[PDB]
Enzyme design. Structure first.
Site, PDB file in Angstrom:
ATOM      1  N   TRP B 133       0.840  -1.185   0.000  1.00 53.80           N
ATOM      2  CA  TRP B 133       0.000   0.000   0.000  1.00 53.80           C
ATOM      3  C   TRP B 133       0.884   1.247   0.000  1.00 53.80           C
ATOM      4  O   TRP B 133       1.755   1.381   0.872  1.00 53.80           O
ATOM      5  CB  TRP B 133      -0.906  -0.019   1.231  1.00 53.80           C
ATOM      6  CG  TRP B 133      -1.961   1.040   1.259  1.00 53.80           C
ATOM      7  CD1 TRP B 133      -2.723   1.474   0.214  1.00 53.80           C
ATOM      8  CD2 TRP B 133      -2.375   1.800   2.400  1.00 53.80           C
ATOM      9  NE1 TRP B 133      -3.588   2.456   0.636  1.00 53.80           N
ATOM     10  CE2 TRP B 133      -3.394   2.674   1.974  1.00 53.80           C
ATOM     11  CE3 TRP B 133      -1.981   1.826   3.741  1.00 53.80           C
ATOM     12  CZ2 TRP B 133      -4.023   3.565   2.840  1.00 53.80           C
ATOM     13  CZ3 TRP B 133      -2.607   2.710   4.600  1.00 53.80           C
ATOM     14  CH2 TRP B 133      -3.617   3.567   4.147  1.00 53.80           C
ATOM     15  N   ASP B 214      -1.343  -5.294   9.518  1.00 60.41           N
ATOM     16  CA  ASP B 214      -2.360  -4.443   8.910  1.00 60.41           C
ATOM     17  C   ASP B 214      -3.486  -5.356   8.439  1.00 60.41           C
ATOM     18  O   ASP B 214      -3.286  -6.187   7.547  1.00 60.41           O
ATOM     19  CB  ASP B 214      -1.770  -3.637   7.756  1.00 60.41           C
ATOM     20  CG  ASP B 214      -2.765  -2.659   7.152  1.00 60.41           C
ATOM     21  OD1 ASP B 214      -3.986  -2.882   7.283  1.00 60.41           O
ATOM     22  OD2 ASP B 214      -2.322  -1.664   6.539  1.00 60.41           O
ATOM     23  N   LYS B 249     -14.145  -1.280   5.064  1.00 61.23           N
ATOM     24  CA  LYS B 249     -14.538  -2.062   3.904  1.00 61.23           C
ATOM     25  C   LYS B 249     -15.457  -3.230   4.246  1.00 61.23           C
ATOM     26  O   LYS B 249     -16.474  -3.416   3.570  1.00 61.23           O
ATOM     27  CB  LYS B 249     -13.274  -2.538   3.181  1.00 61.23           C
ATOM     28  CG  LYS B 249     -12.444  -1.348   2.652  1.00 61.23           C
ATOM     29  CD  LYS B 249     -10.951  -1.496   2.920  1.00 61.23           C
ATOM     30  CE  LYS B 249     -10.152  -0.230   2.563  1.00 61.23           C
ATOM     31  NZ  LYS B 249      -8.684  -0.379   2.892  1.00 61.23           N
TER      32      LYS B 249
HETATM   33  C1  LIG Z   1      -7.539   0.730   2.509  1.00 63.55           C
HETATM   34  C2  LIG Z   1      -6.363   0.274   3.337  1.00 63.55           C
HETATM   35  C3  LIG Z   1      -6.090   0.874   4.563  1.00 63.55           C
HETATM   36  C4  LIG Z   1      -6.907   2.048   5.045  1.00 63.55           C
HETATM   37  O1  LIG Z   1      -7.985   1.690   5.869  1.00 63.55           O
HETATM   38  P1  LIG Z   1      -8.886   2.905   6.408  1.00 63.55           P
HETATM   39  O2  LIG Z   1      -9.865   2.359   7.418  1.00 63.55           O
HETATM   40  O3  LIG Z   1      -9.632   3.544   5.258  1.00 63.55           O
HETATM   41  O4  LIG Z   1      -7.995   3.940   7.059  1.00 63.55           O
HETATM   42  C5  LIG Z   1      -5.015   0.438   5.333  1.00 63.55           C
HETATM   43  N1  LIG Z   1      -4.235  -0.618   4.910  1.00 63.55           N
HETATM   44  C6  LIG Z   1      -4.503  -1.227   3.702  1.00 63.55           C
HETATM   45  C7  LIG Z   1      -3.639  -2.370   3.251  1.00 63.55           C
HETATM   46  C8  LIG Z   1      -5.565  -0.785   2.915  1.00 63.55           C
HETATM   47  O5  LIG Z   1      -5.817  -1.394   1.714  1.00 63.55           O
END
Ligand SMILES: *Cc1c(COP(=O)(O)O)cnc(C)c1O
Ligand SMILES: *Cc1c(COP(=O)(O)O)cnc(C)c1O
Lengths: 378, 399
Positions: B133, B214, B249
């Protein structure tokens, strides 16, 4: 292997538990209307722009500078929606530390304790300037001027727009104007923390000091909050507004500010800022909110008067008239640490060891026992 | 004097948000957005989940105050987060080794972890996969940490170079942070197998790394519990790790900023000491987290019936993305693409490295109005049966 979390040091500390009968320390209708409208009209939760809702920014600048301001017409101001006023202060700090020669921020003594930790979090030195005359419960303007003598050009000087936290003492318009003249002459970068617009005298009157600076300066920053004047505390609704000499400069600077946001929380929370935008951009709904804000302001002032009167009725020999002259939710009572300590443990009346009291938490039902407790520790 | 802002250099374009703003301004009506990861329905909308609308109506009619949350947020939110990450009845929960703070999104959880480490430990370095990312580097650098890259993706074969992954990570030292994507690796979509996860955990405990997970896509690879197997393997062995998770998401709550930062330490005393400094890092950032999104998440996970509606909505998102992946490959073949795109079927989540060059991505945008990231990453969750044909025609035209 040695644990990374082993060498960590506990954090010094910043009621809720004690079960003693009678301890002493809501959503606005306009917000409920706004939220209902959002529940049935929102069709997506898609990411906001880095700087949030554009209408939120337009209404913010009108509140700060006034409709028809030269700053707005010349497009000298850019506003980013932020998580609370605190989030606006952090975004300004990260932006300044990364992109400018700013290294030093001057904050009043006393001030909101979180100012120093927010600016320190970006590696910015924080110095204090004089502000409060504890003898007369007034603004020590002479000492304030003297103590800012060493603030260099390019230093940030932080001002509270209104309802100074914790003293509740604000500069007069003439003092604001004097400070604005001195600020231009010495090349300071003004940063206004404007978290209580509407709780001193009114929306427009509380912005007079900021607009006196806005009329003199090429550059300034405003960290504003809607936590208090909309009752939206836990929704984290604030704004960081940049002002520069011209449209091309502020846009250039604002792109680095958005870069600072992207690397912090990416984009801001919508719900609270949508409420504020919905209310501010609807005439009838704004009239409802403005009346709720006037109601809140007058109630606090009413409690300030009742607090003074009941302190006298209950036998206080100390003169607390200065409480009437102070603006907002906070005033220094003048109680010592030893006098506050008793109230906490001996009367279930909890206040900060500095003697700051919160008029918001006062009511006609708790005023008598509260004042009886204070008169006891005097 | 001279203005403090007069010499500021303009910020470069964000590789993702730079294209997103440009898509918003595009004049052509047939434009297609395959850039930023956001689930779309077959009706061409990014809808609010029904589970969410129900929870929002409950909050509207029952919320009586907006008073500040604690620095760490809603208690029930933290407990449900730890259940999802580690599983009801985990040893980390019973031994009380975990502390969770509600954060503004998974991005906010990453910065909070980075600030916490930069200001309270000796950590100076974070190892991030190549590719990863793009915003990972920006988050960690802004908090004061160096970012180093470790091998991961085999571009020619569209696979995970596990041997190159381990070798590169030998340059990592004890006390260094290593970032792992819980599931649905961004942008490759290639996750390690469970055996590979267990090898990384084994190797991680030996080298003394501080795992940072993450976890933004729990439920989009195979399932809630299944997608956490990699993390839980690390948890079963390590004494310490950090998890930045997101509900943007898997709840469709993108713009409410709902995430969590979870600390795990050897014992209850060490995590509580460490967590007090995390709260201090949060206090000096945004003070306390936004309530609306987290209240929605907590309300759903705490009600058995409401949770079932949500877990079925999530299941419907996962396998609709699976249907678009299959349709995408099958349509590329029908539109004249001769090369093998079968690797797209093997990839998990919303994102897939399409193998398109930077120049090809530029063509798609300027000549065809199809917007992808300059890395060749494409948002499968933005494809629909209706826009599949034109977008595949555009791709074949630039091959
Ligand atoms: C989209 C994404 C994020 C961000 O998440 P948010 O809740 O919108 O801050 C963090 N890490 C990865 C790998 C992502 O794809
Ligand atoms: C409350 C307060 C803030 C922060 O307000 P939030 O919007 O809740 O972050 C900032 N400055 C002062 C002086 C305050 O009293």
């Amino acid at each position: 292997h040695v644990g990374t979390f082993e060498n960590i040091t506990a954090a010094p500390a910043d009621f809720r538990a004690d079960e003693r009968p009678g301890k002493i320390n809501p959503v606005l209708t306009s917000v409920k209307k706004a939220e209902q409208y959002l529940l049935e009209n929102e069709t997506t939760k898609s990411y906001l722009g880095i700087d949030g809702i554009p209408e939120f920014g337009r209404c913010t600048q009108e509140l700060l500078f006034g409709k028809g301001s030269a700053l707005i017409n010349d497009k000298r101001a850019r506003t980013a929606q932020t998580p609370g006023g605190t989030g606006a202060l952090r975004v300004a700090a990260d932006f300044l530390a990364k992109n400018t020669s700013v290294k030093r921020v001057w904050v009043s003594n006393p001030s909101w304790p979180n100012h120093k930790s927010v600016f320190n979090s970006a590696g910015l030195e924080v110095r204090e300037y004089a502000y409060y005359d504890a003898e007369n419960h007034t603004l020590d303007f002479d000492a304030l001027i003297n103590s800012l003598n060493e603030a260099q050009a390019g230093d940030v000087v932080l001002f509270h727009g209104c309802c100074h936290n914790p003293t509740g003492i604000d500069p007069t318009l003439e003092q604001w104007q004097t400070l604005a003249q001195l600020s231009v002459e010495k090349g300071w970068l003004p940063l206004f923390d404007f978290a209580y617009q509407g709780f001193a005298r009114g929306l427009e009157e509380d912005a007079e000091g900021l607009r006196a600076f806005a009329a003199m300066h090429k550059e300034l920053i405003v960290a504003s909050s809607y936590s208090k004047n909309f009752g939206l505390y836990n929704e984290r609704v604030g704004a960081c507004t940049l002002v520069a000499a011209d449209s091309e400069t502020v846009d250039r600077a604002f792109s680095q500010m958005k870069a600072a946001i992207r690397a912090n929380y990416s984009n801001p929370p919508a719900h609270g800022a949508s409420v504020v935008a919905t209310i501010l951009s609807n005439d009838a709904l704004r009239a409802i909110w403005e009346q709720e804000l006037t109601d809140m302001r007058q109630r606090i002032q009413r409690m300030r008067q009742l607090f003074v009167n009941t302190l006298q009725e209950k036998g206080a020999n100390r003169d607390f008239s200065f409480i009437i002259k102070q603006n907002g939710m906070f005033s220094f009572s003048g109680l010592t640490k030893e006098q506050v300590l008793r109230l906490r443990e001996e009367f279930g009346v909890y206040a900060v060891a500095s003697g700051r009291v919160n008029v918001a938490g006062m009511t006609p039902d708790n005023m008598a026992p509260l004042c009886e407790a204070i008169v006891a520790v005097l």
